């Protein structure tokens, strides 16, 4: 074999401890760049003028943050959607002031994570598996796209991208609520059903399989030793688990087909999270949550508040206080 | 400016121009948060634009009533609104029945493009597996991983 | 793909119980503290610095400003038994909005 | 920054005490007969 052939054989090899693959050829460098920049920035980056108003926000540990307050801060509103690579700055000091690390990190990450998804397809193919794990990963991936790319596009700035940090994340959430009433949007509601339900069904599946494990061990050892990696025989009694669950509710509400069960376990969280992602991606173009502000009126025309109006008061609080020096005109239009 | 403001020289709270400032390459642009939108171009605004951006003499002397009308119209039909078609910001009261066609068209087509990407992945992955002969599962008697060396 | 993997099916399915069950139980402990207003509201070190240094800003300080808005703007209607009257002039607001 | 001056020792022992516990149990497991 020639060099290219040998190289291709290595890249696509099923015997590498970690699969590389063609997706991996892009994933590995982009993820390493994003990671290294993030780590250094999170530790040592100076303050960043997120809102383009010469009001720099400190995100790094060395500049007075802890793990909870810290962040890599979004690029400046002055930049908007412009591409701000290192080489468009006059110096690294300028690059840093303007939030250049954010763009480098999110662009390398989104490319790398997209290739992580491709790589899941690729290895499934090399190993003779069915191909759709990558489709389940499209749900968190789409969500990362929504908050780091689609929302900025809609609003016209990477300054409105989710910050890379814990408190930064909460800031993004509170301002999103003020601006889009996300809680009242059915796609975020589906998202909640997706993750609360994913958690519920996770606990339920775990508990039911654990309930029905076949006795293979004694009281002074972990029941886990009753299963051996690669054994042919199933390790729990699905008939007993179904016998249980079908009586807990009623018979036809319980799955007696493992394939159907495991498909439901995939589909419920994945579909819900796809709607979560689509919620963010469509509120990106300001189709917002349901607005029932003053929807209930009495015979005279007096407003009779509902819980929607109370939400509205909270939202107003968020709206009027956020980015307190950035607005000069009465309406926040993006 | 009708009230007497000198809009080129008016310093906002942050030190940036309240009405007018510079883009990162120096072009004169509107200030406030709309600094992000300085790449916008439109026929009602372009007559005010000079070689270096928004021109202060054109601003002071050449703004026509049709431009005022158009800007007022567009400011008050911004593409923001609720799912039940209450126009305006999320905290606005019921009154105006409006969601921009631009919001309807962009959101619908995002949703559809997204699910079409998902369908691309679903069908491309399936096409591959079917072509190679393992779309229905792993052959118990010829499980490929069982013929591969262990990773460790 | 990821570097590690399950090898033991009993462990796997136990872990599926443990994770969400433990999470919920932790959230409950926090709410028990909130019953008493025993919050994680502040980082004292942050507040000392910010009080002394008007140029020091983090996402933590930004969120508290949002919180102050929420409280002032929602309290009068959300807590009617307090008969709050907050004159326009006391309401916390940023520029313009 | 004016941090709590017991945060360092609190954090160090929070890590070291249970980590030590686990390392002791692991190593004595390995040294048992195969």
């Amino acid at each position: 074999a020639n060099l290219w052939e040998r190289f291709c054989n290595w890249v696509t090899s099923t015997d590498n401890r970690l699969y590389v693959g063609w997706f991996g050829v892009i994933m590995i460098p982009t993820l390493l760049a994003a990671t290294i920049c993030f780590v250094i920035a999170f530790i040592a980056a100076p303050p960043v003028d997120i809102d383009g108003i010469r009001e720099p926000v400190s995100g790094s540990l060395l500049y007075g943050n802890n793990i909870i307050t810290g962040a890599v801060v979004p690029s400046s509103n002055a930049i908007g959607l412009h591409f701000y690579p290192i080489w468009e700055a006059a110096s690294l000091d300028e690059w840093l002031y303007n939030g250049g690390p954010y763009q480098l990190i999110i662009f390398h990450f989104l490319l790398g994570a997209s290739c992580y998804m491709g790589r899941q397809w690729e290895l499934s193919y090399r190993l003779g598996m069915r191909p759709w794990i990558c489709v389940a990963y499209s749900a968190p991936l789409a969500s990362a796209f929504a908050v780091f790319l689609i929302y900025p596009i809609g609003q016209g700035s990477f300054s409105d991208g989710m910050p890379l940090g814990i408190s930064g994340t909460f800031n993004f959430m509170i301002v999103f609520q003020a601006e889009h009433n996300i809680l009242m949007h059915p796609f975020h509601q589906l998202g909640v059903a997706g993750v609360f339900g994913g958690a519920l069904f996770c606990a339920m599946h775990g508990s039911l399989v654990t309930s029905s494990l076949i006795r293979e061990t004694t009281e002074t050892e972990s029941a886990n030793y009753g299963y051996k990696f690669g054994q042919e025989e199933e390790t729990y009694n699905i008939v007993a688990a179904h016998g249980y669950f079908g009586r807990l509710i009623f018979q036809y509400a319980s799955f007696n087909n493992s394939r159907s069960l495991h498909f439901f376990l995939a589909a419920w969280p994945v579909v819900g999270v796809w709607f979560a992602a689509l919620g963010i991606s469509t509120m990106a173009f300001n189709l917002n949550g349901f607005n029932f502000n003053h929807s209930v009126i009495d015979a005279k025309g007096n407003v009779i508040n509902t819980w929607a109006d109370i939400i509205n008061r909270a939202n107003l609080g968020m709206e009027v206080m956020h980015e307190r020096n950035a607005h000069n005109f009465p309406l926040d239009l993006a | 400016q009708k009230l007497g403001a000198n809009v080129g020289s008016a310093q906002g709270p942050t030190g940036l121009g309240k009405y007018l400032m510079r883009s990162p390459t120096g072009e004169i642009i509107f200030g406030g948060e709309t600094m992000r939108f300085w790449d916008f171009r439109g026929p009602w605004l372009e007559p005010l634009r000079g070689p270096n951006g928004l021109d202060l003499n054109k601003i002071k002397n050449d703004i026509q009533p049709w431009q005022e009308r158009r800007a007022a119209e567009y400011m008050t039909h911004a593409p923001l609104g609720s799912l039940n078609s209450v126009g305006g910001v999320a905290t606005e009261i019921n009154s105006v029945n409006f969601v921009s066609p631009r919001s309807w068209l962009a959101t619908s087509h995002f949703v559809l493009a997204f699910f079409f990407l998902v369908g691309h992945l679903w069908h491309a992955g399936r096409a591959r597996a079917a072509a190679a002969g393992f779309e229905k599962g792993i052959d118990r008697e010829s499980e490929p991983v069982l013929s591969m060396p262990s990773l460790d | 793909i990821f570097g590690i993997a399950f090898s033991n099916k009993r462990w796997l399915h136990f872990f599926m119980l443990f994770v969400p069950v433990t999470g919920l139980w932790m959230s409950a402990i926090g709410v028990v503290g909130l019953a008493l207003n025993l919050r994680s509201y502040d980082f004292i070190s942050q507040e000392i610095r910010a009080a002394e240094d008007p140029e020091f800003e983090t996402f933590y300080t930004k969120n508290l400003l949002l919180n102050e808005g929420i409280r002032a703007w929602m309290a009068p209607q959300d807590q009617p038994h307090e008969n709050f009257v907050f004159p326009e002039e006391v309401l916390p607001r940023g520029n313009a909005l | 920054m004016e941090v709590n001056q017991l945060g360092l020792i609190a954090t160090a022992l929070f890590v070291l005490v249970p980590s030590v516990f686990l390392i002791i149990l692991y190593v004595q497991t390995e040294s048992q007969q195969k």
Partner: peptide, 30 residues
């Protein structure tokens, strides 16, 4: 001291990832 402590914990986590991956107990079939 605070910064050192955060970075130290993170770096221990990263080392752990390395050992958990490359020096795992290898899975063995029966």
């Amino acid at each position: 001291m605070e910064t050192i402590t955060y970075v130290f914990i993170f770096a221990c986590i990263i080392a752990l990832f390395f050992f958990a991956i490359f020096f795992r107990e290898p899975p063995r079939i029966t």
